[PDB]
Write a structure and sequence with these properties.
mainly beta; 4-stranded antiparallel sheet; 2% helix; globular; protein transport; Coatomer subunit alpha WD40 domain; monomeric; Coatomer subunit alpha
Length: 307
Amino acid sequence: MEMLTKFESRSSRAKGVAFHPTQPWILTSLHNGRIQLWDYRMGTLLDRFDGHDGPVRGIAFHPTQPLFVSGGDDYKVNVWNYKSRKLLFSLCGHMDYVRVCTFHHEYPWILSCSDDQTIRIWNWQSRNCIAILTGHSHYVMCAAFHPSEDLIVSASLDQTVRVWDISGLRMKNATDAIVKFVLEGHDRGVNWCAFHPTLPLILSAGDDRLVKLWRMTASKAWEVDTCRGHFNNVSCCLFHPHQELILSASEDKTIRVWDLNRRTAVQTFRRDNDRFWFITVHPKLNLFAAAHDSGVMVFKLESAWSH
């Protein structure tokens, strides 16, 4: 496959990137504490948001509301309105770095996870923490809401991937969270976990340099296969929403594309000098973004020799 670069931002180290679901924007959250809002069609910096001290790893738009959420090494989960360009409030409660923060697609919830070994669920309408998910015994590096079921997946340096049943919390308001699966397969800490948008699949990746693929039903899960080949920590991994492809990004300075059905290597992209910290895909368009030591890139994936 070939990478068609649409936009590149040169900066100090970038940690997170989020696509707006309908506008041609990305948010980038930087190691230096600042958040940039870029139009990647025009190549223009639309706005800058400074509300954190130290690196900002979590960053996400709300799917429909004019809001985004950011999560920092200062332990704060910040909620912003990008049309008024205001910091609306901070959600405080975590006692160590916030690694990820996202919005739920239907309920008025924000999910965050932290080096304090907890996942928190907050109601952004009430500004209250509505659930603290405990049980991991080391940093929680990633957490994600399932797109259709009342489930959360989380990944921790305790070498486990957890699937949590939050139907109890759903019923009480749009036993609250029960651990459903404790997935055991990784031999070292796990840095990332991801759901597939329409298939019952999970991806996990971590310091063992492995990307593991899992499948599940309501009643059970199974390890399907492993993508092997990265030669340093894997920072991030994701499913291509519309093609039978897996993507991963690593401190070995590569982004790797893998066959979903065979888990064989399809294509590797390298940078001579830059470790990769994060990758994301647009929910609808053939559009990817990657954060690395020198900034952010937005690219299209094409089959080799197709243009």
